[PDB]
Coordinates of C-alpha atoms in Angstrom, one line a residue:
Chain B
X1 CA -3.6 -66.0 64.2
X2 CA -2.0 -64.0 67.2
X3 CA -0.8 -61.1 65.7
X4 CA 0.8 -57.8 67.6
X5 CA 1.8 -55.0 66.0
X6 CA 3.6 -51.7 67.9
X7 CA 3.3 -48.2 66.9
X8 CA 3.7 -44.7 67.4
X9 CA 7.4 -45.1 68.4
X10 CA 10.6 -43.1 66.6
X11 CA 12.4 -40.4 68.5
X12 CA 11.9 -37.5 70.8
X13 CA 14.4 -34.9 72.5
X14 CA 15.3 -35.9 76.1
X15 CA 12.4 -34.2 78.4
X16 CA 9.5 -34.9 75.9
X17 CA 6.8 -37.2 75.9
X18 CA 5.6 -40.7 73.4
X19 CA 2.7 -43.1 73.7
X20 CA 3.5 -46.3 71.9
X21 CA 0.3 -48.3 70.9
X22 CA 0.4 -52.2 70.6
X23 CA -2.6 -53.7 68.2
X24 CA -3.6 -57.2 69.0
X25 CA -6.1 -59.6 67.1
X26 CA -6.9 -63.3 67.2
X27 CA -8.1 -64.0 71.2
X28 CA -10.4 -61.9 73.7
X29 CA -8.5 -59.1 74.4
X30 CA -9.6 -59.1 77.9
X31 CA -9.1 -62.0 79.5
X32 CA -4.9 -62.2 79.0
X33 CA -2.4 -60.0 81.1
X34 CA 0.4 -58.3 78.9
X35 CA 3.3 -56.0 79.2
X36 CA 5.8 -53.8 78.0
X37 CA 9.3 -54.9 77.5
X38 CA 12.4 -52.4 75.9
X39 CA 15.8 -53.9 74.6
X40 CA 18.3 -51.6 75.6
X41 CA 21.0 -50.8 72.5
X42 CA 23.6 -53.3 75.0
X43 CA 21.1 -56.3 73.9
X44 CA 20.0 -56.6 77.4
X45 CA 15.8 -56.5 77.9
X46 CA 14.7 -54.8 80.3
X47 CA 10.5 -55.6 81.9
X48 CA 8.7 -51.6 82.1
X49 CA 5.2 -52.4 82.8
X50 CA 2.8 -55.1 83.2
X51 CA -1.2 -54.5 83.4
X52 CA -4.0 -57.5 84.9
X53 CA -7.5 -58.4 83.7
X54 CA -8.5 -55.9 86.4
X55 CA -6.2 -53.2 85.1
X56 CA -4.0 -53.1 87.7
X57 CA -0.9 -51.6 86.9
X58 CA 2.9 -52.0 87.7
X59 CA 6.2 -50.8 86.8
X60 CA 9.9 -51.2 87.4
X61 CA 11.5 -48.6 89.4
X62 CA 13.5 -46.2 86.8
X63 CA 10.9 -45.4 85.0
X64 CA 7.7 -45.0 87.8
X65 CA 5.5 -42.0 87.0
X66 CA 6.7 -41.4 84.0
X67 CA 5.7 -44.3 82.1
X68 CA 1.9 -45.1 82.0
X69 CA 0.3 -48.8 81.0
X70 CA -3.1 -48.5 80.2
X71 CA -5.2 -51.0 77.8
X72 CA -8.5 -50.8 75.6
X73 CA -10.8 -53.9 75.8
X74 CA -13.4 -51.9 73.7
X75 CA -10.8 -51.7 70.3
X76 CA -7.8 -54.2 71.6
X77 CA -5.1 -52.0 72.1
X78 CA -2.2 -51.8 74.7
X79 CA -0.3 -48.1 75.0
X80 CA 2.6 -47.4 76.7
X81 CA 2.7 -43.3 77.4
X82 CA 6.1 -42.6 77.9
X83 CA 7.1 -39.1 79.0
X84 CA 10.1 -37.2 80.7
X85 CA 12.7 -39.4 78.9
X86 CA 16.3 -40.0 79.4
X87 CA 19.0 -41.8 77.5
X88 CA 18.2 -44.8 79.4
X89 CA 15.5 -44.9 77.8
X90 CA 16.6 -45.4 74.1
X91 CA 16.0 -49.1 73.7
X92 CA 13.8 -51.5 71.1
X93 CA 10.3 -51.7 72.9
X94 CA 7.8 -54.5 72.5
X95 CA 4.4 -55.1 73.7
X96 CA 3.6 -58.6 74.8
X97 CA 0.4 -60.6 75.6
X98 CA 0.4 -63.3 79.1
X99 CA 1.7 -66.5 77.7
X100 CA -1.6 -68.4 79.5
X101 CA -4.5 -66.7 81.3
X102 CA -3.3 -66.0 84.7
X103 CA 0.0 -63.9 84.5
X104 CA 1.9 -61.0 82.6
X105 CA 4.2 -64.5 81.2
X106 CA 6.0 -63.3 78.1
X107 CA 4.3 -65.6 75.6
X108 CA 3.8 -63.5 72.1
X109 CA 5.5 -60.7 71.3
X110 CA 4.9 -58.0 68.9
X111 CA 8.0 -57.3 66.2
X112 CA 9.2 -54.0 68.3
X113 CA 8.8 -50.6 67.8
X114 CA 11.9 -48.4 68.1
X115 CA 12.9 -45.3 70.4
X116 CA 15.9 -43.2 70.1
X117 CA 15.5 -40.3 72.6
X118 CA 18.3 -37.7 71.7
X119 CA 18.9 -33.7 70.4
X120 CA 19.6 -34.5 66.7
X121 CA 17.3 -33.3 64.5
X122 CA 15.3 -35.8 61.9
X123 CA 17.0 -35.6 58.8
X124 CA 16.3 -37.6 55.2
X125 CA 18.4 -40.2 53.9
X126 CA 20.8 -40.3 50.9
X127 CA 20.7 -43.2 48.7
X128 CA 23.7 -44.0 46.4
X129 CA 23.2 -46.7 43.9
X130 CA 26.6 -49.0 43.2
X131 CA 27.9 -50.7 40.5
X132 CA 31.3 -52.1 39.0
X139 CA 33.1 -62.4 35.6
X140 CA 30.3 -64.9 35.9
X141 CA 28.1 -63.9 38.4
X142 CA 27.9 -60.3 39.5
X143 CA 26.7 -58.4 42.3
X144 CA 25.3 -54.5 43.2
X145 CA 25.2 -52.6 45.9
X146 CA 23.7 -49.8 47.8
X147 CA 24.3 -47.1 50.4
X148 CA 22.1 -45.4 52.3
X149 CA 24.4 -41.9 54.3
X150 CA 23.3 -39.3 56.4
X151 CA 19.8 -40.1 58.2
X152 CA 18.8 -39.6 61.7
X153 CA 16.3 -41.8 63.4
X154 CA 17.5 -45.2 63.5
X155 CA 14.9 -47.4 61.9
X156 CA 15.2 -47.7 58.1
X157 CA 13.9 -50.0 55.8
X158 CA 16.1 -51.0 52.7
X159 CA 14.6 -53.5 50.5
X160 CA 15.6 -54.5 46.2
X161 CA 12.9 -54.7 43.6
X162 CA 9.9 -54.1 45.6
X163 CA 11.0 -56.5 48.1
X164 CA 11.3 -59.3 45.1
X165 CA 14.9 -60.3 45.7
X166 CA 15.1 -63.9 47.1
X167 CA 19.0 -64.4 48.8
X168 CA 22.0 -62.9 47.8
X169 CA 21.3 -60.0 49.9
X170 CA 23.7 -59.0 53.0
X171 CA 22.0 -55.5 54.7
X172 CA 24.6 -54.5 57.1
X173 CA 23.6 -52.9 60.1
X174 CA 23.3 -49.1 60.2
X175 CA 26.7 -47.3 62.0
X176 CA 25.9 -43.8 62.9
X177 CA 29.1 -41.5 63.5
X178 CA 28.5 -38.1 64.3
X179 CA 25.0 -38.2 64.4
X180 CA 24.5 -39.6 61.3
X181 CA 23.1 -43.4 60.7
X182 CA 25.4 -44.8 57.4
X183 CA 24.1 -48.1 56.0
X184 CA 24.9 -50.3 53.1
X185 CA 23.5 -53.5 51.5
X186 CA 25.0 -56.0 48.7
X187 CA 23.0 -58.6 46.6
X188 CA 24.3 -61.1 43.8
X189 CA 22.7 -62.4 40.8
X190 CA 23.8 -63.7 37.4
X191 CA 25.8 -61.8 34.5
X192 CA 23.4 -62.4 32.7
X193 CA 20.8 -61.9 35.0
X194 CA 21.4 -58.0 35.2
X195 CA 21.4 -55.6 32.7
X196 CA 18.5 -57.6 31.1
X197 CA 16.4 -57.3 33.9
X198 CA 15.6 -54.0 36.1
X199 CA 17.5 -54.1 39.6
X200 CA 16.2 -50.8 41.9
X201 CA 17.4 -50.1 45.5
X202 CA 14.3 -48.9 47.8
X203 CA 14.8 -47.2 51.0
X204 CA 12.1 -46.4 53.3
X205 CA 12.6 -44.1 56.2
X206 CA 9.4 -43.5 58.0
X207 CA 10.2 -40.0 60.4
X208 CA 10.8 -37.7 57.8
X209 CA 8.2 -39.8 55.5
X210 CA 10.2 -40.7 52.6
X211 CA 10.3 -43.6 50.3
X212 CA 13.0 -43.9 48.1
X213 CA 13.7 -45.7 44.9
X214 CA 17.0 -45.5 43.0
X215 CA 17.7 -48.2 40.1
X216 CA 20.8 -49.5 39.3
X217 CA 22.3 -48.8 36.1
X218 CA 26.0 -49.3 34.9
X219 CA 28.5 -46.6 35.2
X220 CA 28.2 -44.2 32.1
X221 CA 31.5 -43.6 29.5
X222 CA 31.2 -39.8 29.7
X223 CA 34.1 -37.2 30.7
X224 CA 34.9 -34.1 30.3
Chain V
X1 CA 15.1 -56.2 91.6
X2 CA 15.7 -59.9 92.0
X3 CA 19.3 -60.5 89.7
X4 CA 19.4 -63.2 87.2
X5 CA 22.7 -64.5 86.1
X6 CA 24.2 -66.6 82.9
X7 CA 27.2 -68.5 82.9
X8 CA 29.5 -68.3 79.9
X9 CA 28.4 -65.1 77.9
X10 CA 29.8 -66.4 75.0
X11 CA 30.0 -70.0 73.7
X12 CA 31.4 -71.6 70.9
X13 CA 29.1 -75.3 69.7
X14 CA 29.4 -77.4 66.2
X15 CA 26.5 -78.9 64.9
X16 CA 25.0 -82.0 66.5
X17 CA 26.9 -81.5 69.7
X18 CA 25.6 -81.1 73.4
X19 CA 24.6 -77.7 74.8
X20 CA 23.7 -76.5 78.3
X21 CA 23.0 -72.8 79.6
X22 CA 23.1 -72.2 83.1
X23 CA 20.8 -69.4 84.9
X24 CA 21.7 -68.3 88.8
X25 CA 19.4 -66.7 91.1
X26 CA 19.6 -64.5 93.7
X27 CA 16.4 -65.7 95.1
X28 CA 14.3 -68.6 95.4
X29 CA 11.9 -68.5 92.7
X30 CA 10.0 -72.0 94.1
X31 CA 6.9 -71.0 96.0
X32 CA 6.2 -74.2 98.6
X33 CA 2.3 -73.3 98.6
X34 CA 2.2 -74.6 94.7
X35 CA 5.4 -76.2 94.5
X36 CA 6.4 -74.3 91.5
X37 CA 8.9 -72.7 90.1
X38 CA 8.8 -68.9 88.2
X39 CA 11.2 -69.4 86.1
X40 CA 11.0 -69.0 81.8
X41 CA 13.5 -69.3 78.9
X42 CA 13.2 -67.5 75.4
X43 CA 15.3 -67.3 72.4
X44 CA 15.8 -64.3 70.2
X45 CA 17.0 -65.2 66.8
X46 CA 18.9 -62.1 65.7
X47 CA 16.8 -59.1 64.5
X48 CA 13.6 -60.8 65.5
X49 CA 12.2 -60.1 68.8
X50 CA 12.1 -63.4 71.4
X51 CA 9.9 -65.8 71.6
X52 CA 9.4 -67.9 75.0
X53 CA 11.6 -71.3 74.6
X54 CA 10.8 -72.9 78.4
X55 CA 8.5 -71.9 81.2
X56 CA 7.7 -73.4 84.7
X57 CA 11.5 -73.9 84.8
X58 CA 10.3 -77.3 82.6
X59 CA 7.7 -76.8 80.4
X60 CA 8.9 -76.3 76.9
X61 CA 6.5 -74.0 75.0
X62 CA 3.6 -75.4 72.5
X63 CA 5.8 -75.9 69.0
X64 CA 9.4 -75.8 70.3
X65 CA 11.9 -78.1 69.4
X66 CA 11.8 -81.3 71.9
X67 CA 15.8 -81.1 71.5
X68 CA 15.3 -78.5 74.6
X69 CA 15.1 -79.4 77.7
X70 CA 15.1 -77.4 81.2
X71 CA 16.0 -78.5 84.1
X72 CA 17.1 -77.3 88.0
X73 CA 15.2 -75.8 90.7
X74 CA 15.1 -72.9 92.9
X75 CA 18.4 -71.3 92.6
X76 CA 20.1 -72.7 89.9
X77 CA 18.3 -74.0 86.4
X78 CA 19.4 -75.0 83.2
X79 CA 18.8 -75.0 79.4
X80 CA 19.6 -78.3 77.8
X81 CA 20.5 -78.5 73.9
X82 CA 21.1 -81.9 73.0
X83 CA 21.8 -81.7 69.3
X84 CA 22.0 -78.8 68.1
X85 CA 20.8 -77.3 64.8
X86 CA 22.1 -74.6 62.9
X87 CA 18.9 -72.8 62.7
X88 CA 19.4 -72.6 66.9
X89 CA 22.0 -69.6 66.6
X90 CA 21.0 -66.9 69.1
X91 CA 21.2 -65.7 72.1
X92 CA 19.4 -67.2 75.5
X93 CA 18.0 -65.4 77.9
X94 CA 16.2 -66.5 80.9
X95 CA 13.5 -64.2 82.9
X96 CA 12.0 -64.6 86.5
X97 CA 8.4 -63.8 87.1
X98 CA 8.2 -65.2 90.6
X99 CA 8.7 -61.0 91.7
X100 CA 8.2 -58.1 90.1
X101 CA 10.7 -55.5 88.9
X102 CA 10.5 -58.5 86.6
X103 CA 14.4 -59.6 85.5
X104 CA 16.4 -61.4 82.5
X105 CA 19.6 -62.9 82.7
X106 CA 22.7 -60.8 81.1
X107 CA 22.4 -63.5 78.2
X108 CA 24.7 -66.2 76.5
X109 CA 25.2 -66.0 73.1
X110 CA 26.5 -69.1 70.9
X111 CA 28.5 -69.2 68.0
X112 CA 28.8 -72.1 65.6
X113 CA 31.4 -74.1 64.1
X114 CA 31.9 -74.2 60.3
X115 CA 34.5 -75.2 57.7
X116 CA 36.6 -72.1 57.3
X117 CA 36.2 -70.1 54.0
X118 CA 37.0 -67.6 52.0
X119 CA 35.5 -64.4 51.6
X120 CA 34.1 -62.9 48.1
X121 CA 35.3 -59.5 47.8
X122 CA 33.4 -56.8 45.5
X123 CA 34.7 -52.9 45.1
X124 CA 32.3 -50.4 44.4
X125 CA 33.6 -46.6 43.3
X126 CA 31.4 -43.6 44.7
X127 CA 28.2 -43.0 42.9
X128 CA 27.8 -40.6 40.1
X129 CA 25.0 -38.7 42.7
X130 CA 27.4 -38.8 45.7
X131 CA 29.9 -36.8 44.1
X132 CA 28.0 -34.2 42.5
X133 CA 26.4 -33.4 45.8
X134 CA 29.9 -33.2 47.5
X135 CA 31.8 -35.9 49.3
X136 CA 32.3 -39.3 47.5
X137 CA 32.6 -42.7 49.2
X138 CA 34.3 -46.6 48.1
X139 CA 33.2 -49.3 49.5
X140 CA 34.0 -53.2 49.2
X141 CA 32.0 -56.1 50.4
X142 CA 33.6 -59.2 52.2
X143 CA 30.8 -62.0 51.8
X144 CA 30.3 -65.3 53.6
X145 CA 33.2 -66.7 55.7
X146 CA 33.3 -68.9 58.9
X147 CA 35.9 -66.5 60.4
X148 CA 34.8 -64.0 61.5
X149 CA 38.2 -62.4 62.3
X150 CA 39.4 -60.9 59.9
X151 CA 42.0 -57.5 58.9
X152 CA 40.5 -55.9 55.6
X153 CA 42.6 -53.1 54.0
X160 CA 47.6 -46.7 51.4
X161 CA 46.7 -44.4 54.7
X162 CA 43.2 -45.8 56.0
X163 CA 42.1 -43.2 58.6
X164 CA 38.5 -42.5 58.1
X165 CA 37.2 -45.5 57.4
X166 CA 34.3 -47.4 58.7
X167 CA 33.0 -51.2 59.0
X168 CA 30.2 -53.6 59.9
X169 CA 29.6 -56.9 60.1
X170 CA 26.1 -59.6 59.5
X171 CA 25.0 -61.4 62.4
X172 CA 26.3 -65.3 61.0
X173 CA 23.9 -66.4 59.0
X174 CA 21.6 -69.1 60.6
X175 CA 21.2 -70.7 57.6
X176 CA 24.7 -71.3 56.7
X177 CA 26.7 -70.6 59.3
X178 CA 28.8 -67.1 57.8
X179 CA 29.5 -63.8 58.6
X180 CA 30.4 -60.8 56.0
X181 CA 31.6 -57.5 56.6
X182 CA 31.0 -53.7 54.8
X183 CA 33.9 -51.0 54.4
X184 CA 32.7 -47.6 53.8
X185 CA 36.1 -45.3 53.4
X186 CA 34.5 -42.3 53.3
X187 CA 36.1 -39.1 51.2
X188 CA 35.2 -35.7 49.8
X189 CA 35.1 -34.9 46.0
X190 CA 38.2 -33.3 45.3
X191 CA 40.4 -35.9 47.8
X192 CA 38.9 -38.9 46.2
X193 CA 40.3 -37.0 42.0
X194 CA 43.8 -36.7 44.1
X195 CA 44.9 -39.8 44.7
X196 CA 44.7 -43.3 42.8
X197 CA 45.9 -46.1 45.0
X198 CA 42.0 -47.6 46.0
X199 CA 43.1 -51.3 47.6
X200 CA 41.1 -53.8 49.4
X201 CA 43.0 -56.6 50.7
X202 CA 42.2 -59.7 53.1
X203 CA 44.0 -61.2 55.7
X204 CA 41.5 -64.4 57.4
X205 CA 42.9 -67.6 59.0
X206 CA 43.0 -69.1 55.5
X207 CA 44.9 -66.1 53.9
X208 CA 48.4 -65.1 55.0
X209 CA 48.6 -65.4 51.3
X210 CA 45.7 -62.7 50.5
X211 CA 43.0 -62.0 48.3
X212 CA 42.3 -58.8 47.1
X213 CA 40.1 -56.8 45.0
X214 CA 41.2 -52.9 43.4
X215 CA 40.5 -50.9 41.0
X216 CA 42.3 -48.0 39.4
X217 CA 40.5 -44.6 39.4
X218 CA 37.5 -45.0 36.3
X219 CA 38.9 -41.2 35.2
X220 CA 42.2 -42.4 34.0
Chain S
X1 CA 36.3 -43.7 29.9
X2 CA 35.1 -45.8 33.0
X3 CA 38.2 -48.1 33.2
X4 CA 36.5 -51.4 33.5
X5 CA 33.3 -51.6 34.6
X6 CA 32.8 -55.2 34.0

C-alpha cells in the first residue's frame, strides 16, 4: 500500500533533454522528503537530487543545472527533468520517498525507470522462436533492438519456473537476448507455448508461438 | 563528497554460516548534539531495485530479517549476518546521509555455497524466420550448476555468451551461447558442437546436432 | 527431412 511507479524514461542522443515522472499512492504526499537515485551500468548508485516538505532542492555536483527536482502535492508526482546529458548519465534511475518524516532516508523505492543516452537510433526487435527424451524445453531469441529495456515473457506471462531470461548483450549497437523454459514431453505439442516480446520505444508487442520444425525441402 | 568504503568486494558464504560486511568512512557521521549516527544499509536482490536493510547505523528496518544486525560507530560500522539464508543472495551497500552529495559504498557482493552439479545442455538450430531474412543463428543453453566456471564449446570466433545472476532460490547459475552466422555460412559447414568442461567434467558432456538438411 | 527433431 506504498506504491511508486517511474516513467517517462528510455533514451535520448547526448545533448537532449528527459523529464522522468515518479507516481506515488498510499500516504500524504506532502509531508515525506524523497529523491532521485541512478544505478550507473558498473552497479554502483549514485544520489542526484533530493527535495524537503518545503521544496527545497539539492543536487550532487555532476549533474547541477542540468538536472531539475521538482514535486506535485496537488496530483502526487515526483519529476526529475533531466537535460544536457552525457554518458555519465546512462544509468537505471529510481525515485524514492523519506524512509520517516524528517529526511530524504531511502526508505521505498520505485522499480526504476531506465536511461540509455547514446547516437543509435531506436530500432525494433526480431523474435526467433526455437525448437529441437522426457522432459523438453523451448527457447527464444530476441536480435537486433536498440533501447535497452525489453520485456520477454511466455504464454501471456502464464509460465511458472523453468524459465532462464538471460540478460540482454548488445554488440555493435545492437541489444541480443535469449530465454529458455522447460516443461513436459507431453506437456507441449498438446498445449500452445507462444514467446512475447514487448519493447516499449519503438511500441511493439510481439507474439511468436512455438511450433516444431516442419519436414519440408526443396 | 564524503567516500564510503566496503571491505571484501566479493565474498564467498554457505548456508547457515556467519556473515559480516564492513563500511569505512571518511568522515564522522555521529553528530554529538543528537548522539546519532547517519549511517543506513540496503539490500538489492538482483534485478530488483534496493530496499533499506539498517538505518541509524542500528535500527533494522520494519519487516527485515532479525538475523541482521548492525553495529560500529562513527567511522567504521558493520553488517552482521548470523545465519544466513539462501534467499539473502545480493549485494550490500551502505549509504551516508549525515552530508549531502549523499554517498554509497562501492558494494560487496556474496556468493553462495552449493553441491556442485551438472549442467543440462539444449541445442537449438536457427529459426525458419531468421534465415529467410538473412543471417541464421545456433544457440545451446547450459542450465543450473553451482559452478559457475565453466568452458563451453570447430573454429568458434564470433560467438557470444551470458550468464543468470545464481538463482536465490536454489543456489545456480546457467549460461546462453549465441554463435551467430549468415545464411549461406551456416548451409556450408556441418560440424555444430557444444561441449562442457565444469569442475565435475574433465570427462564432458555434450550436446550436437548434425545439420536438419542432410 | 529435419534430422531429428525430437
Amino acid at each position: 500500500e506504498v506504491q511508486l511507479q517511474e516513467s517517462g524514461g528510455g533514451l535520448v542522443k547526448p545533448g537532449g533533454s528527459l523529464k522522468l515522472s515518479c507516481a506515488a499512492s498510499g500516504f500524504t504526499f506532502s509531508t515525506y522528503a524523497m529523491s532521485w537515485v541512478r544505478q550507473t551500468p558498473e552497479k554502483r548508485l549514485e544520489w542526484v537530487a533530493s527535495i524537503s516538505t518545503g521544496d527545497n532542492t539539492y543536487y550532487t555536483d555532476s549533474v547541477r543545472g542540468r538536472f531539475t527536482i521538482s514535486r506535485d502535492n496537488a496530483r502526487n508526482i515526483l519529476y526529475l527533468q533531466m537535460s544536457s546529458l552525457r554518458s555519465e548519465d546512462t544509468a537505471m534511475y529510481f525515485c524514492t520517498r523519506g524512509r520517516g518524516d524528517r529526511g530524504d532516508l531511502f526508505g521505498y523505492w520505485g522499480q526504476g525507470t531506465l536511461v540509455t543516452v547514446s547516437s543509435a537510433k531506436t530500432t525494433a526487435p526480431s523474435v526467433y522462436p526455437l525448437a529441437p527424451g522426457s522432459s523438453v524445453t523451448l527457447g527464444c531469441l530476441v536480435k537486433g533492438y536498440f533501447p535497452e529495456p525489453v520485456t520477454l515473457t511466455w504464454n501471456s506471462g502464464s509460465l511458472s519456473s523453468g524459465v532462464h531470461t538471460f540478460p540482454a548483450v548488445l554488440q555493435s549497437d545492437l541489444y541480443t537476448l535469449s530465454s529458455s523454459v522447460t516443461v513436459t514431453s507431453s506437456t507441449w505439442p498438446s498445449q500452445s507455448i507462444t514467446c512475447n516480446v514487448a519493447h516499449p520505444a519503438s511500441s511493439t508487442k510481439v507474439d511468436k508461438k512455438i511450433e516444431p520444425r516442419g519436414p519440408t525441402i526443396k | 563528497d564524503i567516500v564510503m568504503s566496503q571491505s571484501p568486494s566479493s565474498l564467498a558464504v554457505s548456508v547457515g554460516e556467519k556473515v559480516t560486511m564492513s563500511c569505512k568512512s571518511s568522515q564522522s557521521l555521529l553528530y554529538r548534539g543528537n548522539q546519532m549516527n547517519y549511517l543506513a544499509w540496503y539490500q538489492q536482490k538482483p534485478g530488483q531495485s534496493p530496499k533499506l536493510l539498517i538505518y541509524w547505523a542500528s535500527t533494522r528496518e520494519s519487516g527485515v530479517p532479525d538475523r541482521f544486525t548492525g553495529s560500529g560507530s562513527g567511522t567504521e560500522f558493520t553488517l552482521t549476518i548470523s545465519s544466513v539464508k539462501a534467499e539473502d543472495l545480493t549485494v550490500y551497500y551502505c549509504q551516508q546521509y549525515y552530508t549531502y552529495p549523499r554517498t554509497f559504498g562501492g558494494g560487496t557482493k556474496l556468493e553462495i555455497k552449493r553441491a556442485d552439479a551438472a549442467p543440462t545442455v539444449s541445442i537449438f538450430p536457427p529459426s525458419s524466420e531468421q534465415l529467410t531474412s538473412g543471417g541464421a543463428s545456433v544457440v545451446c543453453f547450459l542450465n543450473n550448476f553451482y559452478p559457475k566456471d565453466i568452458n563451453v564449446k570447430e573454429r568458434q570466433n564470433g560467438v557470444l555468451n551470458s550468464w543468470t545472476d545464481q538463482d536465490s532460490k536454489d543456489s545456480t547459475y546457467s549460461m546462453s551461447s549465441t554463435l551467430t552466422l549468415t545464411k549461406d555460412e551456416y548451409e556450408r559447414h556441418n560440424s555444430y558442437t557444444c561441449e562442457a568442461t565444469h569442475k565435475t567434467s574433465t570427462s564432458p558432456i555434450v550436446k550436437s546436432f548434425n545439420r536438419g538438411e542432410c | 527431412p529435419i534430422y531429428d527433431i525430437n
